[PDB]
Amino acid sequence: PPGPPGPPGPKGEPGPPGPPGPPG
Amino acid sequence: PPGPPGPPGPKGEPGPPGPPGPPG
Amino acid sequence: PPGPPGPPGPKGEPGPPGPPGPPG
Numbered sequence: 433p434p435g436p437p438g439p440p441g442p443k444g445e446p447g448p449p450g451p452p453g454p455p456g
Numbered sequence: 457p458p459g460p461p462g463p464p465g466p467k468g469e470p471g472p473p474g475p476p477g478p479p480g
Numbered sequence: 481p482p483g484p485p486g487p488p489g490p491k492g493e494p495g496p497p498g499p500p501g502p503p504g
Contacts, residue, residue, distance in 0.1 A: 438459035438486035447468030447495030455501050456477040459483030468492030477501025 434481045435457045435459060435483035437483050439461045440487050441462030441489030442464045443490045444465030444492030445467045446492050448470050449496050450471035450473050450498035452477070452498050453474030453501040454476045456479045457482050460485045461489075462486035463488050465489030466491050469494045471495030472497045474498030474500050478503050480504055
């Protein structure tokens, strides 16, 4: 039979920047 | 033999809101 | 034969804080 499944993949990309902050 | 590493994970979550803007 | 691909990798880390609120 085939070998075992491979390792998990690499971690994903950093998330997007958040939205602009509140008005001053 | 073990299979290949899996695909990259998904992109992270959107970041926090930024800090307050300038006075005015 | 080689095994199959591993699972998708972990989700990426949270994104950075947004920019400061806009002038005015």
